[PDB]
């Protein structure tokens, strides 16, 4: 494809860059994308919910009623799931992993596909490492730059590979903007953000990673 | 992850009991009893819907044969007269309603002469 670099002046650079056709997807599979964003959502539990079973609850060994001469339920156990003692017979447990195995073949295929769409979504504007120099950690200049870039409509993601300090000194006092590494991104993250800036150096590495 | 359905059950029983009304005494006050009353009333209403059409034709046969045998002829005679010649589509209820229409039944009796 093709995309124009954006500058700190709030406008695109007059020099477009050519992109190889090997990166743009030609077989669109979104159900694998749906599974990938699920597995990103999955494995997010903390094992905080639990319950006690019939034997996990305490109590005495008294029998509420004997074998006969009773006008109500036999009730041979001191504690039951339906008694006031509580405890769901099945309930939740802190051992339900609920983790789904996914193969990296389809995952990487869908990831390359979604990266192709997101780089051709028109929401991306190529940036570089130079503009963040001479800048400080003040979110005032960052907010002003985003207002000039008018990217406040959606969450702006900053792919990072060289770790410019001014970037992480910002984007914390604001809600939409956040920063993560190129590997650390996810399909769920890409679609949820719907806005991002890319450094010019990770292009070749991303294409090689495919 | 405790899930409570008290409000859902209360709303369900409320909408179930809203149908039941005008019963005898405390009958429209118990959810379980009113359920059975409503179901039985619906079944009997369906039965009456099925059999009222069954009995209304007989009712009109009574009410028309009264007039016919008051003129000296059975309902069978009228059915035969309709059957052979000058077959009519005038319904047994509408021919019965012709009693409610003054100076009309005479027109039928003079017309069926043959």
């Amino acid at each position: 494809a093709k995309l124009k670099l954006i500058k700190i002046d709030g406008s695109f650079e007059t020099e477009p860059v050519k992109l190889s056709p090997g990166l743009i997807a030609k077989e669109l599979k979104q159900q694998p994308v749906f599974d990938a964003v699920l597995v990103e959502q999955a494995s997010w539990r903390q094992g905080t919910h639990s319950i006690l079973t019939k034997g996990e609850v305490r109590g005495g060994g008294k029998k509420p009623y004997k074998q006969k001469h009773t006008g109500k339920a036999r009730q041979g156990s001191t504690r039951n799931p339906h008694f006031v003692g509580g405890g769901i017979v099945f309930g939740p447990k802190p051992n339900r992993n609920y983790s789904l195995k996914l193969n990296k073949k389809a995952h990487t295929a869908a990831l390359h596909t979604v990266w192709s769409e997101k780089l051709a979504s028109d929401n991306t504007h190529l940036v570089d490492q130079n503009l963040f120099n001479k800048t400080e950690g003040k979110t005032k200049v960052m907010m002003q730059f985003l207002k000039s870039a008018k990217l406040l409509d959606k969450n702006v993601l900053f792919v990072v590979n060289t770790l410019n300090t001014n970037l992480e000194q910002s984007t914390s006092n604001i809600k939409n903007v956040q920063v993560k590494h190129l590997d650390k991104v996810s399909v769920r993250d890409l679609m949820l953000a719907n806005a991002l800036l890319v450094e010019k150096e990770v292009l070749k590495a991303l294409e090689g990673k495919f | 992850m405790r899930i409570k359905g008290g409000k859902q059950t209360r709303v369900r029983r409320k909408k179930w009991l809203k149908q039941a009304s005008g019963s005898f005494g405390t009958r429209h006050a118990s959810y379980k009893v009113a359920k059975q009353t409503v179901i039985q009333a619906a079944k009997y209403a369906y039965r009456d819907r099925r059999n009222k059409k069954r009995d209304f034709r007989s009712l009109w046969i009574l009410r028309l044969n009264a007039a016919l045998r008051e003129q000296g002829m059975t309902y069978s005679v009228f059915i035969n007269l309709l059957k052979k010649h000058n077959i009519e589509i005038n319904r047994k209820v509408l021919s019965e309603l012709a009693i409610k229409e003054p100076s009309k039944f005479n027109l039928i009796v003079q017309k069926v002469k043959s």
């Binding site: 979104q30 159900q31 994308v33 749906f34 964003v37 679609m191 949820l192 | -």
Partner: protein, 148 residues
């Protein structure tokens, strides 16, 4: 897609209810019938249990294995029809492990198998060979040296 329009294609197949609802049915034992041992909770039949009939294993004789306490040595077999798909030439154990036909961190005796004639002369370094396979590979002008 998006988190507001995320839709499946053929997922979420039909489920079964065993203790909820009767207007939609399947609130009773739900497939176990009524008044049965299996209908009771955890009511089933053991695999050897046949209702009183003798289990099938104790009605028939048993196999006898002369290789008892002995583990047979495995043999990677090279069938000519299948290895025809393989493009390797001048075959040796060094080249085979590179193509992952056998595990690199493992060595196993090699047997030759298959009378399916091929049309290229190659170099074979195997440990065992079938007579018809040997004829097939010798008539194809390939060279075979038996290893031991």
């Amino acid at each position: 897609l998006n988190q507001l329009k995320s839709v499946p294609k053929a997922r979420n197949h039909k489920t079964k209810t065993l203790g909820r609802g009767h207007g939609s049915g399947l609130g009773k034992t739900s497939g176990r019938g009524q008044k049965g041992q299996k209908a009771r909770k955890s009511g089933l039949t053991r695999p050897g249990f046949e209702g009183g009939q003798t289990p099938l294993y104790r009605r028939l004789p048993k196999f006898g294995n002369a290789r008892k306490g002995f583990l047979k040595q495995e043999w990677v077999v090279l069938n000519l029809n299948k290895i025809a798909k393989l493009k390797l030439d001048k075959i040796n154990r060094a080249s085979l492990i590179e193509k992952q036909v056998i595990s690199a961190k493992s060595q196993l005796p090699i047997k030759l198998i298959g009378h399916t004639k091929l049309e290229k002369p190659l170099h074979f370094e195997v440990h065992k060979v079938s007579k018809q396979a040997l004829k097939a590979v010798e008539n194809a002008n390939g060279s075979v040296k038996l290893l031991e």
